[model samples]
Target: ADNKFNKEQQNAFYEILHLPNLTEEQRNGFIQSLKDDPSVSKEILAEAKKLNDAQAPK
Candidate 1:
């Protein structure tokens, strides 16, 4: 449903990290792009950066 994307976007970048098959390179690439996107929300961007910087899930 619409709420899936809405609520998920509301949560944003955290879900991407938990995604099972994605690589760190891929994730960071997206986050960098996320940072580059001017229209991206400040809250999502903040979390995107924080987690992007956090690094090395192990």
Candidate 2:
């Protein structure tokens, strides 16, 4: 597998960062869904901000 992180990876990284309580699989799945849907992505980003403080940065 490519070690290079995609948009999904970046989203997962930040999701884990904000929660720090989810399983790795959960983080990956959570963000993958965001990548699949822009509305969900926006919503996730909004909620993510409540836990942390940053944008997708992309």
Candidate 3:
């Protein structure tokens, strides 16, 4: 399955990909979803984590 993301995963993907103003909670949810769902690609998870790291408050 190339695009088998659940609703939560979809929401997370949309936010990460399109929204520039994402909250920590949103990033966390995406990261957690990646961890929970084995179907998600490793490349995607890595990118998501990178995005989260960049957006995270320092």
Model 1 poorest 10 in a row by lDDT: 1-10
User: What does candidate 2's lDDT look like per residue over 1-58, in tens digits?
Assistant: 5455568656755655557444566556667766575446656655555544332333
Model 2 RMSD, rounded to 1 decimal? 8.5
Q: How many steric clashes between backbone atoms does each model show?
A: 0, 0, 0
TM-score between candidate 1 and the true structure: 0.40
Per-candidate TM equals 0.40, 0.41, 0.34
Runs with alpha carbons beyond 4 Å of true place in candidate 2: 1-17, 42-58
lDDT of 1 by residue, 1-58 (tens): 3323344443555555564445677667655654465246455556545654566466
Candidate 3 residue-wise lDDT, 1-58, digit = tens = 4757777666656655554545767766666666676467455656665766687566
Better of 1 and 3 by lDDT: 3
Candidate 3 weakest lDDT stretch, 10 residues:
12-21
Off by over 4 Å in 1: 1-10, 38-58
Q: lDDT, candidate 2, residue 13?
A: 51
Using lDDT as the measure, which candidate wins? 3
